Amino acid sequence: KIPVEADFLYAYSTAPGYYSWRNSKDGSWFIQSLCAMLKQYADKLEFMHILTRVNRKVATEFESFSFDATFHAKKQIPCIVSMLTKELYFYH
Amino acid sequence: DNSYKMDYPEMGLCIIINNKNFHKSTGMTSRSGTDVDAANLRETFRNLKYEVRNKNDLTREEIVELMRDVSKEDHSKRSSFVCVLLSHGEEGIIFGTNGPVDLKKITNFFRGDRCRSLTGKPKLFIIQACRGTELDCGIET
Ligand SMILES: COC(=O)C[C@H](NC(=O)OC(C)(C)C)C(C)=O
């Protein structure tokens, strides 16, 4: 037997309780970064390591800009929730 | 066995739910820019050899039956499963075009005991959506 909740990976765009930013022209910061990292590293890195790269790219390369001071200059960190039991590689 | 078996005949499905326009009653602004994400994910996952299926503007009900029907599929020949949710949301909640849906209700269909052909296989859920109203003001380096 194995837990019924095992082998599940939840890659959230932002931390619990926080907003998730999306640029009407380029797309969401998260999805943007995820695709880039996967396109560049999915042929060598393990999933958790790629998602960690996504975390850095979103945390460093993105900052909101808004005419509304309330939403201006805000950052974002994604959230990797893993219940995986093995290493995941998109290749063999 | 430190790595999942990914040498099955198929990499698996990649269900992308792309909600852009929400019912007027919900009071949720259109998710402009979301099509760019859907197209990006589609291309990206096609390269990883996933069988991509894009669904646009689904109601809270359509999201459930979609997930239910997928979990009821025979994934035997598939290495894994992937589902991406692009929409508005709150903590533990993803929005259909007509209302909220609990993330738990969605993921349960794939529970190790409820979807036998995916037991022991990685089930990925990429969730692009809000999880509350807090803003990260950041800190200088
Ligand atoms: C995934 O993109 C969005 O729809 C998330 C949405 N957040 C959001 O739209 O933030 C702005 C309005 C783009 C700054 C939410 C509060 O759930």
Token digits for A9?
């990976």
Does ligand 1 lie within 6 Å of residue B28's CB atom? no
Domain A1-92 has CATH 1.10.630.10: no
**Residue A1 neighbours by CB under 8 Å, 6+ apart:** none
Nearest to A73 by CA among B132, B137, B139: B137
Provide the pairing of β-strand B123-128 with B78-86. Answer: parallel
> If you count residue pairs, one on A and one on B, with CB atoms under 8 Å apart, how many are there?
148
Burial bucket for residue B115 (CB in 10 Å: 0-12, 13-18, 19+): buried
| Alpha-carbon gap: A53 to the closest alpha carbon of chain B (Å) | 15
Token digits for A64?
């909101």
Angle at B121 between CA A39 and CA B113, to 5 degrees: 145
Q: What phi and psi values does residue B105 have, to the nearest 5 degrees?
A: -55, -35
Residue type, A21: W
- The residue in chain A having the minimum alpha-carbon distance to the alpha carbon of residue B50 is A90
The secondary structure element, H or E, covering residue B13 is: strand B10-18
Q: How many Å from the N-terminal Cα to the C-terminal Cα in chain B?
A: 41
What residues in B contact A74, CB-CB < 8 Å? Answer: 135-138
**Residue A4 neighbours by CB under 8 Å, 6+ apart:** B111, B112, B113, B114
CA A81, distance to chain mean position in Å, is 10
Q: CA–CA separation, B74 vs B41, rounded Å? A: 24
Relative to the CA of B130, which ligand 1 atom is closest?
A: 17
- Cβ–Cβ contact A83 with B under 8 A: no
DSSP β-bridge partners for residue B127: A12, B85
Nearest to B44 by CA among B14, B23, B73: B14
Q: Is B127 helix (H, G, I), strand (E, B) or coil?
A: strand
Q: CA–CA separation, A55 vs A30, rounded Å? A: 8
Provide the pairing of β-strand A27-28 with A79-82. Answer: unpaired
Method by which the coordinates were obtained: X-ray
Q: CA–CA separation, B34 vs B74, rounded Å? A: 30
B55-77 per-residue burial string, b: 16 or more CB within 10 A, e: under 16: eebbbbebbbebbeebbeeebee
Q: Give the resolution value in Å.
A: 2.2
Residue matched to tokens 């609990």: B102
Q: Is A86 helix (H, G, I), strand (E, B) or coil?
A: coil
Token digits for A39?
């396109």
List of domains in chain B? 1-141 (3.40.50.1460)
